[PDB]
Design a protein around this ligand. Structure first.
Ligand SMILES: O=c1ccn([C@@H]2O[C@H](CO)[C@@H](OP(=O)(O)O)[C@@H]2O)c(=O)[nH]1
Ligand SMILES: O=c1ccn([C@@H]2O[C@H](CO)[C@@H](OP(=O)(O)O)[C@@H]2O)c(=O)[nH]1
Lengths: 124, 124
């Protein structure tokens, strides 16, 4: 069972950082969205457009998937996204990321019925 | 089993205009620090001072805890803290918080050996 001391540090300590940072986004979001458990996911992109806009990409430009599958689609317009990339300093479990705000076209794999995004392939 | 569609939303969607804004700190932190599992913790404070300074409080001014326990201590000096409070809008599993930065004395309960902070009681 997590110690009371450890619980206090988890719930109440942020030594660490300040809320006024813009660059801590990936650190917190990768943790929030459970991509730092077991190991640090090295690269992950968050999309800030609406879910409807991202789902719409599945009806947009058919493109080659980086993994050679044939179910990828490129957005017709650039989207506001954030790339989270694990730093060289980063060491599990202290997963550290650089946050890069970008506006690029996204490529996603679509699947299911209705066809919706199931994998983020790349940005271009 | 987490659906592929849901996994994509978790890994890659963060819809909004100012994702990295300071106003989003509590949303991100409350999630990352596991205070939005099951229910939204209604009120929570993060402390931006060194862990040594917070541990030091355990040898500072004795005060009675809000709950009548007798192991609380008030910081001799003010500390940089952030309050996270649920908004009217907020409802599980969509926990929403208002982020507020203040400088206040903290009151914590101390326990264990060494005696360290185990509960965040109040700020004054
Ligand atoms: O720009 C990119 C490129 C890649 N990935 C991400 O990196 C992993 C390997 O490609 C993929 O994770 P995964 O194969 O565990 O779902 C994911 O799409 C991104 O999130 N953004
Ligand atoms: O200023 C405050 C006041 C309260 N709490 C918080 O509210 C809960 C019950 O009061 C406590 O969480 P807990 O019951 O998991 O210890 C916590 O200290 C704060 O984090 N800051």
């Amino acid at each position: 069972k997590e110690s009371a001391a450890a619980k206090f540090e988890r719930q109440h300590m942020d030594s660490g950082n300040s809320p006024s940072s813009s660059s801590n986004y990936c650190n917190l979001m990768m943790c929030c969205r459970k991509m730092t458990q077991g190991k640090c996911k090295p690269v992950n992109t968050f999309v800030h457009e609406s879910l409807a806009d991202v789902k719409a990409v599945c009806s947009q430009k058919k493109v080659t998937c980086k993994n050679g599958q044939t179910n990828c689609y490129q957005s017709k317009s650039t989207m506001r996204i954030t790339d989270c990339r694990e730093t060289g300093s980063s060491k599990y479990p202290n997963c550290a990321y650089k946050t890069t705000q970008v506006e690029k076209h996204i490529i996603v794999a679509c699947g299911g019925k209705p066809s919706v995004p199931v994998h983020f392939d790349a940005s271009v």
